[model samples]
Target chain A: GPTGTGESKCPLMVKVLDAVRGSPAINVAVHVFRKAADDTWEPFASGKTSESGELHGLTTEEEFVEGIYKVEIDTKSYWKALGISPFHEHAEVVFTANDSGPRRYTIATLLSPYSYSTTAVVTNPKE
Target chain B: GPTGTGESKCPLMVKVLDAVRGSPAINVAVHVFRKAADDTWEPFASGKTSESGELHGLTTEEEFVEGIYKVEIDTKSYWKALGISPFHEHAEVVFTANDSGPRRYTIATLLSPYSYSTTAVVTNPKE
Candidate 1:
């Protein structure tokens, strides 16, 4: 069941805010990928940040479960719409869920077409 | 086959730097999640960022494909190691590859425990 934190559950959380001095909104999306204990990685889950820079998540597949995971957000459309040549178009955040029970992820990104900032709040079931 | 840009596809770019001046060396990992067109999202691709903050691509499941995507970097461990409460424990950057093509993603999360920055280099086959 998806948690109701006004958002969904994620292997991670994501957000992006326009950082162009006074620019207001920045479009954002979250991507998810998983890596086993010592194995390779594969894409798994994803989401998008809301107008308030909030991203809700979707249910990931079982095969897409376990180990370290990654999440990404898109800032291109937001940045480009402002007519700027941003050196960086995206912000990336990654975390781990060894136990995998309570998946509560929160990641937020701040952007200005040229600059960015982010945070991840991972509270998996096991800790 | 994932394009050969020595990396996989991602929706965002990530980087972190030691904004607290200098100390060099910061730990970083890359996260991935996906979102469909005008729809919700789900977890998908997952990968750990290398020591260089370079995140390799993971062939996310077909269900984890399409639309806008996001990536994030864990700055908690990196910031915690420095014995400081970082205002941000993560760095996020996101982008989009609307057209499915030769995916070549390069998201660098530069961190210094004190500060961060990122850039998403997405040159999907179709542009």
Candidate 2:
């Protein structure tokens, strides 16, 4: 069951916005990757932004363990779908997670044709 | 001289938005710091976002040399002023610039009470 608040059930979430349109970036593909012990990126979870430019339930608290992670947004495909050519191939955000303790994360991104910015918000998990 | 487009005269610019309010983040403080030769950060320029959530004229093409720069946004104050307690202390974005050639940069940030994300757009300067 999908929780309306999303904080209780969702350990990892993504929110994306289209800076050009000044609206939520719906249908943009989001891929999550974790760095394996072999120093290679291992596929974890993937989804597309919802109507509100958000995706939840990517991973669970137990599965999203302490490690390095990468959240790659398919910005090129997103712009191409809108009939526009973009600059970067994609937008990627890499960081270490759960180094200290259990935490929930919300990765937010803003996108333009030739530009994108991403930030992360980590909080203690809700009961 | 200020150009309307902000790409000609301004080599570096910033745009901010409030994710909670779904509007441009006006009057947010932005501080720019360049890594010095001794590997210490030195003050470069500082300003606040305009009515449109944009700040231009941070640096010129000549002065913004090849170096590591950090763009720190005073997110705490912005959220506090709105009667909200934010999670992070402040939001900061660090990157290397002008490595290949002279280019224009726009650092955009989205702020929430508990989260913030920033992205960079690098483009060739307009004549």
Candidate 3:
């Protein structure tokens, strides 16, 4: 229900904030990957944050099967565009999902030139 | 300079926020540990966040020697006190510091009942 499309269709979502400017980090790129059977990372979805610093409709519940996932944020480009040098090459968050049952996830991230932090909000699909 | 003492005395700092309430997470317990040479986590210091959800004076520059440090946040208790059950047992951040020099670190964290994210802001001491 957090998507711009006004629907609860997206099972996974992301929101980014700029710590330096104290605003939403718009137009930041996000890439999602799933670990394959051979321990390889397979690209699943990719998108850029909207004006609200949020991205939705990344994947559907039926398609996002139980597995380990990695959400990589292109943080360097975001900071560089603002004329600031960042510390990390990129930011990546790895976690497992749907081990018990179907759920929805909202990954929140706060970014500074030298630092970034990420957290997740998981809830039932109906909620 | 982000401390309540009105001085940049702490080399390592932490800030926590509540995603559900969209405010600073105050009074949350934070524990710091250094990975000892014997491959054990040696407790270094511990404290709680202030009203602004910021904690300082955890360690001094000389005492916070270069090593692998883990910051364990007592998130479960914070959420439990609010009558909400959280997912993770605790939030732990591990990173190598001062590899290049005596840099300053501000670990920022956002929390929800089912998720949390953490990011670091590393900067020069003078800044």
Candidate 4:
């Protein structure tokens, strides 16, 4: 199946928001996936944000263990619907998985037309 | 605030998968944003996939409406962490919105290191 020892036991969560406004975003598309053995990306799950602008329960331990993972968002498409212009076509968050055992991590993303930022929070089993 | 009329009433959902394996992605970062008047992007929402490889509830109606948007994935980081070479730094899905009244769209993204695909589905009140 996949490679790795136990690093795949990690679970991660992510949230995107506005930078200057600091407002929770809404109606955005979110996706999670890993690099497969053949160099292709194998997705595990995905969905759209609710009125609260949040997406909970992003990944399970079995799906994220010791693999390179990516979080991709549809920026331009969302903007176009709003009748706005975009800077970059899209945005991405690429992270490495370490053999850090089993843990849950929450990644918070702050976004703007000019820039974006992210912060990961660990819950359960403090590192 | 932001400009535009009812065109912003459109909502979109996205799912990423393995092009060859047709597997769900995990631990991946996804973001959605719109272009601002000044030509910068204002993020609407974002999140990662869960164990099932999914991220639901990515936005609020007020956050995503009438704009150009994009779905971006962090591809290189995922690959590097797994000690693999990547074809691209990331993956993207850019789309435009229209004054199609109020509607919800689901965008499915099939991703690979070299290629990717997406589809949008609409529900509630029908198109």
Candidate 5:
């Protein structure tokens, strides 16, 4: 649920947006990975946005902790499938989580061919 | 140049970092784009990091202004080419540009599979 009231893994919800038109980006592929003790990265979870350009309840297979992790957006395939030449190839969101408390982070990444923007709307520590 | 002295488009310098190991992500792909009036995004510029995981002097094809823009990193191919299961497809940096002055901006993105972090290292107006 969107409410952060229980002690559990920090469920990260992501929304894909179009910065240009100020609309939702549909069918974008999103993935997640975690860092290991030995400094290797491992896949954790993944999913695609609906027509509303939103995906919620992104959790992990392993025990969640307070560390650095990343979410990747398949910009190459998304752009290629739409027949658009992406400025770069893909996109990534990297952040350190101090999810020791009850706070779910909802991230919104506004996207386009020329540029993109990502921010935490609800439960950003600064907020 | 790294120094922001002349009056021109705000030169953006980017660095890719491995958040877990705290190392530079060498040979990573990075790209940039700009937003238009009709709410469309257009490709402005693109480049890749060097062996040191740094890309300097990313400028635009048109006159730079203060507007929303995005930077895309080819995480999908970077991971796939390296034989890794990417968590998300790509990573994007979406931000509003206030490049109307001589201040240059440098952005650093710490990345891994399970998480990601993007921040301004130098000349952040908020800083």
Candidate 6:
């Protein structure tokens, strides 16, 4: 349907930590998609955050003509960038992907100001 | 303490699909940071995704140099857009970004959404 073309038919990656350690960060946000029919669900693509921090979002918008898709990311400015005072400000994720399947997608998190944990990894996509 | 060259860091990734079943598309959102003091998690850095589905905003400079930081992503947003209504909505996430930790980091409603189920191996991103 749409193969926009930055040249990333399928290549995703995500990794983050600080469930209690040093803890320092500020921004990040990503979102892509796939899922059709009456149950319908489609978004297509998106990307943000760069400058050596390395958050991801790439899409030539091709693969995903198969089924089920749903992914999301948005961390409240890294808990207000360390002022420290978050209980459960935000975080929710449900992952799934497979055009022909598996390329390289990893979504990981372990936060604190209370508690947090997230996971997703299929792997491949770096050409 | 690595905030130089265009601040805003608290992000992540991992998402895709094909599942040799029936249809296809995309949708997703995000993650971020907070919690200082250390259990040893200092990933304080990262971000991705874009193109005006109306994702999100406002980092300015400095918010999460705090106590416990961790956030991750690989969204599949607005759930395929479904052709409408998701200018600012990815799908799922684990959010927390506070200065003293929380000023106005909503991490808002509808509760991320859901899907995360597939099986393939082109490994473009996931299965």
> Judged by TM-score, which candidate is best?
3
Per-residue lDDT over A2-105 for candidate 5, one digit per residue giving the tens place of the 0 to 100 score: 31122245467778887655677777888877777887668866778877888765763145567767878876677677687555446767656665444566
Binned by DockQ into CAPRI classes (incorrect, acceptable, medium, high), candidate 4 is incorrect
Cα lDDT for residue A69, candidate 6: 56
Instruction: Kindly list the per-residue Cα lDDT of model 6 for residues A1-127, writing each as its tens digit.
Output: 1222234544654444454432322245555556667766667665543432245445534553445556554556566666777777466565556566655555555456677655554543342
Listed in order, the DockQ scores are 0.18, 0.14, 0.17, 0.05, 0.09, 0.03
> TM-score for every candidate vs. truth?
0.46, 0.53, 0.54, 0.44, 0.48, 0.24
Model 3 Cα lDDT, one tens digit per residue, B1-127: 3433222457889999998998999999999889899988899889999999999888877777778888889988999899986655567776778878788889998887766667787788873
- In angstroms, give how far residue A91 of model 5 lies from its true place: 11
What are the runs in model 1 whose C-alpha is more than 4 Å off? A1-11, A21-26, A36-41, A60-65, A100-103, A122-127, B1-115, B118-127
- Residues A89-113 of candidate 4 have per-residue lDDT tens digits of 5666555566653366665666665
Local accuracy of candidate 3 as per-residue lDDT tens digits, A1-127: 2333223477888999999888999999888888999988898888889988998888887788888788878888898899996665567776667658548888888887666667777778465
Chain B TM-scores of the candidates: 0.62, 0.91, 0.92, 0.76, 0.78, 0.24
Q: Is candidate 2 or candidate 6 better by DockQ?
A: 2
Candidate 2 CAPRI-style tier: incorrect
How far does residue B113 in candidate 1 sit from its true spot (Å)?
A: 5.2
lDDT of 5 at B70: 86
What are the Cα lDDT values of the candidates?
A: 0.52, 0.77, 0.80, 0.60, 0.65, 0.41
| Candidate of highest lDDT | 3
DockQ of structure 4: 0.05
Report how far residue B127 has shifted in candidate 3, in Å.
5.8
Better of 1 and 4 by DockQ: 1
Candidate 6 chain A: worst 10 consecutive residues by lDDT? A1-10
Chain A TM-scores of all predicted models = 0.63, 0.88, 0.90, 0.76, 0.78, 0.29
Model 2 Cα lDDT, one tens digit per residue, A45-126: 8888888999887876667778877787888888999999665557666666754755777888888775566667777847
| Weakest lDDT window of 10 consecutive positions for candidate 5 chain A | A1-10
The digit string of per-residue lDDT tens for model 1 on A31-96 reads 666665566556665555556665544443333345566665566566566677664445555555
Q: Candidate 3: where are CA atoms >4 Å away?
A: A1-127, B1-8
lDDT of 6 at A41: 63
